[PDB]
């Protein structure tokens, strides 16, 4: 409906433009007087729209995620195999899986908006003595056959498979950025195929899921919306990882999963988040405006990219100020708007009602590409009332341990 999703193979060559080979954005981190990814390989990626890659690589860019074996004490929800994602022909599955995800969330009206959003939601670039232009931690690095640059690239988001354990999923927000609001790509580590799944009475009471299911798995279209959405406020400079945290249940949930999860939650650190919103606003204001009043050029593509990512950011030339209440209801509607309980209702998919859970019921294994599986439409529940296509009891979810 607005982005294109493009089609792409991983055996497709390497065309320098959609298909790349991509050194990764955290090569050069050091950690501790070691530079942990070098000699990391450089590896195929796939700009699936504008700024939006996807990688079918696991992710191995932590210390803490360099061993794909388990540890020595593993959760009860946890799997571990090395060989998930190593031959080509699972990367071409990976691909084409993410690919069918992104056509589910580009169904709606409101996941075309969220794309696009993703799509043209730039970091704000550095002043550069007159020149404002992106920097180094704003760009990858497209590179030849034996180590060289080709070009510098930008990069909004960028999803890989995941690291040491196939359940687990998240955004890595490149860098610190991410809540000043200057706003950096992020990330995402995300498998398709290996989902934990949840009681039904994790959801709420509202729902309208059918009383055969028991257990369900949930759309990983919208698990994979969950961490878009930290990926999204990323972009946006506004994480609020380390804003605060609040006890549910008890145990401590930053500020920032509550937001992303959406739903009732929100209400209970609302007296908290409206405390440190005017902070949030003003380091938008702050990073913004100077930079934007620099460009001396109208026809400045950086100036457009800016005021169609803060609609709120009036002005001319020279001159460009924030409309204060404008800002402050657009940053809110990021939030009420693109969230993973809305994406549900949206998709029309289960969820659960809250971002912390007590446990996980099971973990599963399921190829959204195999037949009669999983369609753009309606996900699992192609023919399903009561989200029935959702239970665990499918033929096509296979419980792992
Ligand atoms: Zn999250």
């Known amino acids: 409906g607005m982005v294109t999703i493009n089609d792409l193979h991983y055996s497709d060559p390497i065309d320098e433009d959609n298909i790349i080979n991509m050194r990764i954005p955290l090569y050069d981190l050091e950690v501790d007087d070691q530079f942990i990814n070098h000699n990391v390989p450089d590896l195929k990626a796939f700009q699936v729209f504008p700024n939006v890659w996807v990688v079918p690589e696991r992710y191995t860019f932590y210390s803490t995620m360099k061993n794909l074996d388990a540890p020595a004490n593993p959760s009860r929800s946890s799997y571990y195999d090395p060989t998930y994602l190593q031959s080509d022909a699972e990367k071409e599955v990976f691909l084409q899986q993410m690919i069918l995800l992104f ?3 580009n169904s709606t009206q409101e996941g075309q908006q969220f794309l696009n959003l993703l799509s043209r939601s730039i970091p704000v670039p550095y002043e550069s003595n007159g ?3 992106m920097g180094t931690t704003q760009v990858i690095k497209q590179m030849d056959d034996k180590g060289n640059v080709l070009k510098h690239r930008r990069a909004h988001i960028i999803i890989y498979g995941p690291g040491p354990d196939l359940m687990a999923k998240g955004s890595k927000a490149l860098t610190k950025s991410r809540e000043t609001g200057r706003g950096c790509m992020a990330e995402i580590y995300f498998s398709p195929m290996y989902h934990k799944t949840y009681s039904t009475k994790l959801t709420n009471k509202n729902s309208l899921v059918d009383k055969s299911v028991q257990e369900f798995v949930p759309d990983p279209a919208v698990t994979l919306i969950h961490e878009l959405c930290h ?4 972009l946006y400079g506004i994480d609020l990882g380390n804003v605060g945290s609040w006890e549910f249940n008890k145990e401590a949930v930053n500020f920032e999963e509550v937001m992303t999860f959406g ?12 405390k440190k919103i005017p902070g949030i606003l003003n380091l938008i204001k702050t990073t913004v405006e100077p930079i934007i009043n620099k460009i001396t050029d109208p026809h400045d593509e950086m100036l457009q990219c800016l005021q169609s990512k803060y ?11 924030f409309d204060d209440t404008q800002l402050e209801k657009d940053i809110r509607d990021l939030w009420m708007v693109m969230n993973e309980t809305m994406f549900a209702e949206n998709l029309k998919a289960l969820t659960r009602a809250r971002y912390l859970v007590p446990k996980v ?4 294994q399921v190829d959204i590409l195999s037949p009669n599986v999983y369609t753009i439409d309606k996900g699992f529940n192609h023919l399903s009332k009561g989200f029935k296509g959702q239970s665990v ?3 096509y979810f ?3 341990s």
Do not use: C, M, W, Y
Not at 263 to 274: A, L, Q
Not at 311 to 321: A, D
Not at 361 to 364: A, D, L, M, Q
């Open 311 to 321: 609609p709120s950011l009036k002005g001319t030339l020279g001159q460009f100020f």
């Open 263 to 274: 739903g009732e939650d929100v209400k209970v650190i609302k007296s908290e988040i409206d």
């Open 398 to 400: 296979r419980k792992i």
């Open 393 to 395: 009891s499918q033929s």
């Open 103 to 105: 056509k589910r969330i």
């Open 131 to 133: 020149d404002v232009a």
């Open 361 to 364: 019921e099971n973990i599963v």
């Open 231 to 234: 990926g999204l406020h990323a």
